[PDB]
Design a binder for this molecule. Structure first.
Ligand code: BR
Ligand code: BR
Ligand code: BR
Ligand code: BR
Ligand code: BR
Ligand code: BR
Ligand code: BR
Ligand code: BR
Ligand code: BR
Ligand code: BR
Lengths: 105, 163, 163, 163, 105, 105, 163, 163, 163, 163, 163, 163
């Protein structure tokens, strides 16, 4: 989204880095290695504004980056939002994401 | 490991690659047809080591035991460990054993028989007397002491065999 | 090998597949928990070889030595190599050793003691005289020559042990 | 195994990944620098087994033989298997051998010489007579029976060597 | 302030990270543990523009973050500005702050 | 420039930090140590927007930082654009720059 | 000590912090796994003191006693305190004790046996006569005075043991 | 450690926690009622060590010395170290000491007295003569040599005491 | 323990207090400069115990051994255990040793030398003869028997040393 | 030292120049590949000193010892220090050693063997008798005294070696 | 070298860099704590050379001399050069020196005493008579020729020492 | 190292500083007038080592050899290694050599002559006969055996020289 929440296991304020890319492995329309650039297209560093509560990171991004699709939690410090060929990647250092969702006021 | 094919246009490509990498990686720790630096494993085929081999635990080879009275009360107990036979002379001379005679009560079985004639040196309890028993390749042992009709024969050692 | 997860929608899929393939492939030449056809390696677990094993270099087993005067001036030097004890009888009879008596200065330590009684045949320098010393499982060695008060006992051989 | 690089924007990505997984997987069954639980393989380097090793087939070590008439008609036949020398005393006393004399017709070669003196116990055919031959580090053997000018010396056993 | 100066012991350009938070330990109005969130409220990562001279960092922040209260130097790589319950935290990486003050143009 | 391209040797997305400064070692008008501040003047952290392709970093900076000079490649992970006394410095961590040029659309 | 977690947004913070500080502080005077400068405490593990240790009270070590008639009426009383055996020779020579003979009525138990032969010097009441009794590692003590058939043997001292 | 109370609504709350944390932390390095791995410390109470204790420096126990003429010119010098008394026989026989007589010039102090009778073996300078002096529980030493009126008594050793 | 400062306005107050309490609490079970009721620990500084100390395991002190022929064929074997030297007289008189003479082959090293002259009582095998050897602080041992040219000297005991 | 590049337009020029000067300067006092006038250092390569070298402390060279009975009870103890072998002749003639005969119990190992034949002069205790033992390059030592069957051979000296 | 700091905004930048460059460069030719390929230098610390060292000039070691009359007119002159003592026997037998007797006029000082007994072989002028003098570790030299009362003793050689 | 000047207002300032730092730094690894911890290097000047020096490889000193027949068929072979001369007496007495006579066929050259008279002890093959040859500072050797006209003189050792 614009404002996305990441729940985590740290008692601190882990750094979060957001990336945007198209056609990553298994997101291609016509299956594996069917896209124009194997492995994914241009990776864009998403500018973020970070805010912290106990075990919660509030990630603010420009509106153009809003993408609600499938919220996929990867067993390490990574959450993905996948909408067909498009991916919004959230990478957390020094902690593990336990839950992720668009900020509901 | 059993792996699935990876091809252009396939569905669940990432999951297939991951599962294939994990299947292969598992065999690098245990199982499969690979010999590991840990765990109990059975290995087949002629393994030739061209360097030095060190064994800190036990080294077990094929073992077989036999015991019998050769003749005249003399008992021979054998244990084959690889190409070596461990012997122990025992019993008590209970009848007349002629000098240079064949001990005809029991022969040494073929699996314990040497390629060449073996002279097993022994001693008689209570004095300075020695003797020897020859085990030829036939296993029909021969007594090479003098004519004897009493005493306690003893002696522990080894002799070579082959396979 | 240490490999990273491969999943749908990961950035750096091509690079993670490459780096996982490389980490796995490295362990096919050296390192990890796999035994290789090159290099010095440490291997744990019960390795059972069902075929023929050939060693062209050395084969080193666990070794331990001990030497002591059993009694009467008789010295026994032992070297344990696996399940075999190599012995060497030495010294000089310095006091009266009665026929069939126990040698009570020093007992053979437990780690060098046989399962069953072992008869070590020896010879006295300068004549035709033979004796034997029994090593029972207790380690209290017994002299089976006649009553003797002098001489040079000698004899090199082996006797079996287990573990 | 021989694997090709996988990278972002490559042509024939799926084919390369598949052929890399297959090349690696092949080495988990046979070939490469990996030791397998099947097939005849040659292995190099110091392999240290910290556990129990069992061999069900044959265990072949480096072997070397030597035979020679030490002196006085006494023949000594040796076979070195690793750090053990299997001996067999043979021949017939054909001349006068003084007590405690050196047997000077042939010396035991250096590769069969022990660290310390080894006393090889033997028996003379026909009676209760024993003797011993010492093998010192020099290999110049020494007779420790009394002066003898005839007889048939016999005895089979082992003595240790090192490397 | 908007433009703040941190004097330091490094001969280099130490990274500075600024945070904004309310009700931290000992800043609560009605004494210790009297606030709504024990330990402090939401921590906001302050966007900064960094500029360097010899042993001087010029920290430019948005004007909303201007808070001149009491300048507290902590015997390590941290300087605080405290105005009642509100704290502006300066964390230096790989150097110690020796003095901190608002920039006078 | 405003949009600059750094080619590199990494198979990944290396972090790029940009700095601007005047009168560095050997950029002084009247030769070595002829300027007002010896090591160089104030070091300004240039804000960046980074996007990546294989072995290519697209560096987007404010237009005010545009500079066309001599493009100097340093043996390590660094690239400079020098025009007289003025330098724009590209520092890549965990990779080496192999080529640098202004982005042509 | 058993302490409760302190965390952001905590339910009853000050109470928790205070009670955690008190639980920890209590262990700085008595209890817990800490050794204190007061009270009776049981301590486990290899404590190595690299400096000087002074003991103003008593130093109690495990002790074991044994007493037995070695032979010929000679009594040996022992007390093992650590690696030292305190001995006391007592009794009265009640039968003929041959010079250099073994005292065969009772052997010194293994736990009281030295690594090497210990010569316990004694004196015979009423004259200038000394003797010694050897305790070999087997525990079969030996009389090293001349042939004696009477007298009162005495002597108090120590000999070393090990573990 | 001396710590201040921590309560909700407190003034200088953080500074109090910090002082309290530091007071406690100080006692984990030196001072207080805790035994440390550094510095000179005095420890009270029954300290029971259930494991092995090693001392690399000195082990000082309670010591007391005494020396006196027992009688007939015989001097006994003692040093009590824990439960052991180190003795040294000295002097010169200056008058007639009857066989089996009590040495009545001075008694051994009660603190150096054994529970049971101790026989201290000695030698006379210049010949083969040995004697012994018994120390009974009373401290009135007894001479167990024959009647003597001259000579140099010597002997160093130990005897046990208790507390 | 290594703890972080707790102060007014700090960002992670509750987390720092928690981590500081846990770091301190950890040192109440293991590690740090505190002596615990469990585990192997090395302790430095003069530890004075004013009460009763009990050791249920072993008490190991600094040990050093030496053996040398003092002269005339007399061997002295020493083992220093703290402030006590355990001695054993051995060898065989191989030359004329004059009465009251210094034994000039080898001196007892300084670390084994007593503060005051010690008299080590011994006995000669096969008769009633006793002697003594004095160890002065110089280590030049002195024979206090009569002039002797043969015999087997024996004797086990202790003498005190200091540091 | 590890120094960074100094170049036109560099950020941190003054600071890189300073840190480079300090890194180089540090190696002028300790560390690096430079030999200093202080501290313990390991130096490799052929160092040829064309002037005079003085050593005020110790000069330690590669050392190796060996000791063995050459034959007839004659013991030769060797210590190789660089290109010199320090020898000490010991033992006792225990059997007939013929004039000009080889000593056939043990040869001098190759590492202690001279390039050319060395004549080691010795003396026999108790009279004016001298002998010499030759060490040829083979290590089979030769006795150059007359036929001897008793006596104490002695002699300390050196002979040269090379490598 | 002593170098000044180079820093941002510094006054006399180029002059400081140049002067620093020169101060450092001077130490690469002479002075400082660096060892150079020219000039007389004093070097401290354990210098370990792992390669070959060649010295074309002189190699001076710590030297110490001593000369004295051992007894009976025999003079021993010694020079210690490192771990070797160069000796020269001189003098004239001026009194009766008994076979196997101690030379009691002067002992060899401790710094010249060997670890073990050294046998210094010498010759008497005018005939075929040899002797030896033993230097034990005590320095009390012993004469091992027969009883002698006249003659000129000579002999030059070396014996080893250690530190 | 060769460095360029750095000055205010120069062109190519950064490249000059860089080249100067690199030139200096190069001399801290190899070359220049500095002694390194690697490589073969030639060092001049009096190097005084105040600490301990250890050499693991070879220590080569200036060597010179000489051999010649002194007279009467007596050959002396010498090798000077620093301040020590290694000698070997060889040859065969082929003419009458008078007692205390000068050996006038060849003189020991000046470079091999000692500061003081050296007595080289030798032995005559086949018996107990010893002699000595003196090397005075002139090199005109002297025979100090009796008048001799036959025999094989032998003896290896060393004598000192100086510079
Ligand atoms: Br794309
Ligand atoms: Br017989
Ligand atoms: Br031998
Ligand atoms: Br036969
Ligand atoms: Br709040
Ligand atoms: Br400027
Ligand atoms: Br023993
Ligand atoms: Br007596
Ligand atoms: Br002596
Ligand atoms: Br010695």
């Amino acid at each position: 989204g614009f404002k996305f929440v990441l729940e985590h296991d740290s008692e601190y304020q882990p750094e979060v880095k957001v990336t945007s890319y198209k056609n990553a492995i298994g997101t291609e329309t016509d299956g594996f290695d069917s896209g124009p650039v194997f492995g994914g297209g241009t990776i864009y560093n998403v500018p973020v504004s970070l805010s912290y509560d106990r075990q919660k990171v509030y990630v603010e991004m420009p509106k153009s980056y809003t993408l609600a699709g499938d919220i996929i939690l990867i067993d390490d410090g990574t959450l993905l939002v996948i909408k067909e060929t498009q991916v919004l990647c959230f990478k957390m250092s020094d902690a593990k994401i336990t839950k992720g969702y668009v900020f509901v006021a | 490991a059993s792996i699935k094919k990876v091809y252009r246009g396939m569905k669940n490509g990432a999951e297939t690659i991951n599962d294939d990498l994990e299947a292969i990686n598992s065999e690098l720790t245990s199982g499969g047809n690979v010999v590991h630096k840990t765990g109990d494993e059975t290995i087949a085929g002629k393994k030739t080591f061209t360097g030095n081999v060190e064994v800190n635990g036990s080294l077990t080879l094929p073992t077989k035991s036999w015991s019998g009275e050769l003749g005249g009360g003399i008992i021979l107990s054998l244990r084959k460990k690889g190409t070596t036979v461990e012997y122990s002379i025992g019993g008590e001379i209970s009848s007349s054993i002629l000098a240079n005679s064949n001990l005809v009560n029991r022969s040494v079985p073929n699996e314990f028989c040497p390629r060449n004639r073996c002279s097993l040196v022994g001693h008689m309890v209570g004095g300075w007397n020695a003797f020897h028993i020859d085990i030829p390749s036939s296993g029909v042992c021969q007594w090479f002491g003098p004519t004897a009709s009493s005493g306690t024969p003893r002696g522990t050692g080894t002799y070579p065999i082959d396979h």
